[PDB]
Amino acid sequence: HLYPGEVCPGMDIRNNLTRLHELENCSVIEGHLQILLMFKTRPEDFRDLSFPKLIMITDYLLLFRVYGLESLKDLFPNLTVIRGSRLFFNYALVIFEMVHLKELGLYNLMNITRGSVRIEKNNELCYLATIDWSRILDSVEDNHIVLNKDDNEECGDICPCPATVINGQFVERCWTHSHCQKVCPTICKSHGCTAEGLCCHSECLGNCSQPDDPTKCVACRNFYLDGRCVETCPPPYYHFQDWRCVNFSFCQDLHHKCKNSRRQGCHQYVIHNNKCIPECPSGYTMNSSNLLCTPCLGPCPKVCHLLEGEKTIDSVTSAQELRGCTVINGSLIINIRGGNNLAAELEANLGLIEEISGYLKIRRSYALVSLSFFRKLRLIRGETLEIGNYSFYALDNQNLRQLWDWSKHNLTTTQGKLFFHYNPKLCLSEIHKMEEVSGTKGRQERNDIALKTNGDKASCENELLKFSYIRTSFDKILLRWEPYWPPDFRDLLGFMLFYKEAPYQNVTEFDGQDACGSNSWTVVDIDPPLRSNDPKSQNHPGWLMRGLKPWTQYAIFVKTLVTFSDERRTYGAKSDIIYVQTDATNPSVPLDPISVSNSSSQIILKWKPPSDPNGNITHYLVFWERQAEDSELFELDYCLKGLKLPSHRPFEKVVNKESLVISGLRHFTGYRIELQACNQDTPEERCSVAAYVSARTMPEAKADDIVGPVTHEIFENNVVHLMWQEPKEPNGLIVLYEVSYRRYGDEELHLCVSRKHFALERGCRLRGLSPGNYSVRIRATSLAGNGSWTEPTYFYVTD
Amino acid sequence: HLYPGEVCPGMDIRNNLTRLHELENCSVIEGHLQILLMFKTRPEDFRDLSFPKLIMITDYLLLFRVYGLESLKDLFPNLTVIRGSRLFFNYALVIFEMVHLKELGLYNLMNITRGSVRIEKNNELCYLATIDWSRILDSVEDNHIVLNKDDNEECGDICPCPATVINGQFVERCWTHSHCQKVCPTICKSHGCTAEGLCCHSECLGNCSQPDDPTKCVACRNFYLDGRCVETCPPPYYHFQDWRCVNFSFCQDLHHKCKNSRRQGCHQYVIHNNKCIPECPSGYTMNSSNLLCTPCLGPCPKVCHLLEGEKTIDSVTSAQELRGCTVINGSLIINIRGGNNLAAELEANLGLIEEISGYLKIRRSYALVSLSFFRKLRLIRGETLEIGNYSFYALDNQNLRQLWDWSKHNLTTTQGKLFFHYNPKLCLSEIHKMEEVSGTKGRQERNDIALKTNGDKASCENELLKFSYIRTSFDKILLRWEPYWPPDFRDLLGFMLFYKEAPYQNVTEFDGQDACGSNSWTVVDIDPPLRSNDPKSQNHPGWLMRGLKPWTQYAIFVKTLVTFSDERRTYGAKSDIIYVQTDATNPSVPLDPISVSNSSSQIILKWKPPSDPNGNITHYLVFWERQAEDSELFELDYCLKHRPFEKVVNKESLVISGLRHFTGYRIELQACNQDTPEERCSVAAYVSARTMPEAKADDIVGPVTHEIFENNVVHLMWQEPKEPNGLIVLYEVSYRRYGDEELHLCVSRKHFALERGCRLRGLSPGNYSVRIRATSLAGNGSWTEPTYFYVTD
DNA sequence: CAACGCATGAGCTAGATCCG
DNA sequence: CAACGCATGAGCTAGATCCG
């Protein structure tokens, strides 16, 4: 047969040889097989155990710290292929730290599909270089066989096989002293082969029985089906673990085996593209009965069935299993017995839930002030209830002042009863507002929710405050609200002014952050103003808020304050929040202006947008200046050592970009470049200080050398005068003419003429000239460098 | 008289001219006089007002933004002297941002005692450079007169007195166009002077009526006594405000006017060294009846008389008023309605208080931990009681678990009643421990302190856990305690292991209150162990801690944990804390290894102690080696362009002397503790140094002989230094003829090696003088003898 | 009679209807 | 019968009486 034996799950053996007994009849082992850490095991109980029918291994084989095995060929006589479907530690087969292993014995391996082999730290193995991994392993660039007994060539290495020449040597490759590694002709690479060199059927591997038959060889390639195997089996069956395909009656049971959540090593198996896969991936969720996966229009829930029907969340890690879960099929109870700060972390841990079916009880909650962490709650089913048929439960909580923001939120409880007892910091109108947004209207117990033990310790307020005049500047805003008095004008402590900046308008109401936590509202208090006994008076109390960064939206509100006493009045008043943006001003400086010179007439300049914009900037303002050369360099004797080598004002309104090039300018000239960032213009044209950079453009190739009639005059004392013309536009400035004269047979002897020496003389001279035929050649060396040479002018003075 | 008028406290005037009316009869203004910020004042309201009797100013005179004045002489006709006892803004007289001041008018100013004058931003002033400030003030370097109308020389400067020559010019010095600055002869400096040059009595200043009399000049120097003034008045009187002295009957009344604490401009005046001073300073405290000041052995209390009998404490700022008080003369109430973290700041703010006279009330305490911030409480008097005659009050505090550690604390309560209601986390036995340390034993009200609303929500524990075996490594510590089971061994959640390091043993205990702490006991939890139904089994549970630093004392304890139920049993158990130090290991590397070379032989070397000592380091271990010469210099033509040790103990620096001169040396050093068991020495750090040349070993002595060849090329033969400083690289070889200078030549290392000497090609025949100097790589040396040889023509 | 002038704007002297 | 050996010591394989 192909695989006549039994399927067999991946196992693990430790500290005994007892649980190796369950490999009696299984032939293919999906998963992996790790046997590790046996210590009190003699070498004698291995010479009678064997497993003759074992062939297929999917993931890896790992033998690690075994004491008593000397040759594992007596345990694995017939395994041929390792699929390598899961890598272990970036390896596929690892034998490690064997203490009594004489020889390996893996003489029947044919094709490692994926991965590499690793053998370390074994002072008892030989024949390790007689394997020819290159004929089994497709990738030998990951092999790692170091620190063994064959670190020194000392163990014999004799064996009775082709003795292949894969390297430059006639290396003989044997497994044991009784077996060589089998190599037949390479006319078919991995197609399976015989002892007589006949290649077997194209779709199988390894050991073979009859050639060119897909029904009686051993280990085939892609899949397997009932004694046959084709590369893509037809879809009465769907592929499974990339080595089989099977009818959907089979693997629909395994989905129902661990729908009973008893082992989390399984997967809720789904059908997708004829692959009974663990999970159809992101952008896909499963349907109920057909076991397919649905293209998941928008976000699809990833339902999260709760364990044991209920749960209590008390810290971070109890809720950290709940991250990503959206629909919960049970009941939840929150209880933060103290705690420092959860008000920042529940949104990243549980702030994406929408659906629960049981009941939500809060109790003993110390540092919770709102329920704004429940961002996406819309419906509670209430299928299971608390005793007395209760669905929402609140008891003995000391800081709860808000439940939700009912202006922008929706919540419905289908059945059950709400509960609110001994919750002294939440006013009675809120749970009345909670009653109207929910489904229940008259479902009360009598006694229902406690009307006296809730909100008694907290003065909930019923009056509003409006502003009167708001004023802007670039730095300071101004507030002045309408006056107020309590019904006793003596009992008044003043007001508090809460403010913070706001980039958006999804800003919370005063959530009452009183425990530990993040950024609260920064606040200053106000001395209560003077009584005047007049209706028209200066009773409007003002305050200046000063230290504000400009061009930023800022939110404000003001709250009353009163002492606590026996009378249940003078509740105070509370303003509503608004939004006020400050004005803008002069902006910041530009950043990093970069000048690059490519040609003599192109000069590109790029900068970076400014650090502080202070409003939408309209454009940029640029200015340049044509620099001047140094006038003190004109009077230097340049044949003394030291020669130099360098490297309104018009404008444009550059808009909507980041760089600009300027053309039409002088060659090899320095330029001081300054540019201003500047906001809106036709009212209050106001710009920053310019960033200043320097720039010199490229020189021109012919501006250095001069052409002209080089005429000469011979005097009576053999001092020949020389007249020529200067460069009209030098690259910066001419500094020295390399005047040189050459007699035939004599070298190019050079002289000097300075800038002022050429200026005073209008040429040069040559004193003490020997009579002959000389050739005078000049090079005009400017400050940008040397020019070209002139024509070597011929003149002959005779004896 | 000397000062006939009246004393006058320092006033401030703003927004009007009405409150100058109270200066009608006073003559000396102690303090300062600031008149500032009037706007709705015409320039014509001043010409009918003056103050003819003003003489002395103690601190400063400040005129700032006055609209309507034009000349100060209309108001201050007799203003003479400024004492400058307090400097405003580091100046003594400031006339600033005046708008209509044409000319100054202050002409009688004689002596500024301390400070300088500042006139700024007045573009209507003239004659400002006609003052001669050096003959009024004693310091002129700190003067600052800038940006006036005299920024340009434009206002005339015409004036009818010496026109002195203090600078290089004949500058005229005068105040107005009608008066000039008066300077008499300098035979006496500031001793008072007449118009006729007669110097007055030695102890006064300024204007004067009759000379050489201490009774009828005007402004005198040190003090003042009844028309006379002597430089130190006898102690029937005590000096006051450094310008007067007076009997003790005077300033004992101002001490009693101040004890009616109606203004914080007080100074509780005490007598000290005949000076009725504001405060006798630190190291001194006043006595009650005698009004002197006592030398204050130890810290003396600086008593803190609390206002309106009581006070509330809720934040960082209400307690910041009472920093540095020890005794409080009233009752105190605290109420911490939440907050974030206030445990770490109370000892910095109020941890030095000792005594309370009234009563102490705690209500609505939310986020407290203990009362250990009250470090030095020992007694509460209870001179005021609460309603129902109550002295201690704790009510509705939802977290409190520990009052004090009574083993290291003493506290008493004289009278009153204690109150403990609705404090559900504090054990009932702690108040019984509070009852026995207090003064009261059986003064109960019935109903007294609540025995039911306190301790119900928190099971205070009554059983202890002992340890069984501790083991230490250099990095890990192993812990194992005796087993424990509740009376129901199903109800058990495990244990908690709190630990933190501690350099001392004054460690806070666990209390079990939430206050939002930066440092805390870091904790891991333990799975509860297996039940085995055997007394002798492996029921001792263990845990290993690993992430520690070596050689550090560490404190540990373990607490039980159980579910909350309705039966009032299974409270749990709590171990007692102990201390366990880790072991020591191989230490770190020493730091900052610096070696300096001062001579050719001495090498001083200095380092630092290591960053990680890991125990008491016993000694050090040094190793030096003889660095070899760089042999790559052997081929450069320079005519072109075991190891000895010592166990150094108990010091930080070491010198290595008595060794071979001019050799480079690589030296290393190790730091390590004890040796003969567990030989533990650390890694080494390496230095390098280079030394100085010698005097005579670089120079070679020897017969510089010459061999004469026939081609006028005389050979030269001498010897090389057998021990130079390192390596001889160039012999400064030279030859000198009569009338010629010492003409030099050069020779490399190989050239003297290949030839064994030198030559001189194409030599003029004469009596030459051949002298060689040895110039090694470290510098030059001495010359040899200039050798004479006379080749003939 | 509804910003600017007869100050500056958070560096021991007031604190933006604070002033008319 | 009271540290070492027949591992390492917090880098998908156990977690310091974890194995005797």
Author numbering:
A (entry chain E): 1 to 160, 169 to 655, 756 to 907
B (entry chain F): 1 to 160, 169 to 649, 756 to 907
Article sentences:
The insulin receptor (IR) is a member of the receptor tyrosine kinase (RTK) family and a key regulator of metabolic homeostasis. The extracellular α-chain is composed of a leucine-rich repeat (L1), a cysteine-rich region (CR), L2, fibronectin type III (FnIII-1), FnIII-2α, an insert domain (IDα), and the C-terminus of the α-chain (αCT). The β-chain contains extracellular IDβ, FnIII-2β and FnIII-3, transmembrane (TM) helix, intracellular juxtamembrane (JM), tyrosine kinase (TK), and C-terminal domains. IR autophosphorylation on intracellular tyrosine residues stimulates two major signaling pathways: the AKT pathway initiated from insulin receptor substrate 1 (IRS1) and the mitogen-activated protein kinase (MAPK) pathway initiated from SHC-transforming protein 1 (SHC1).
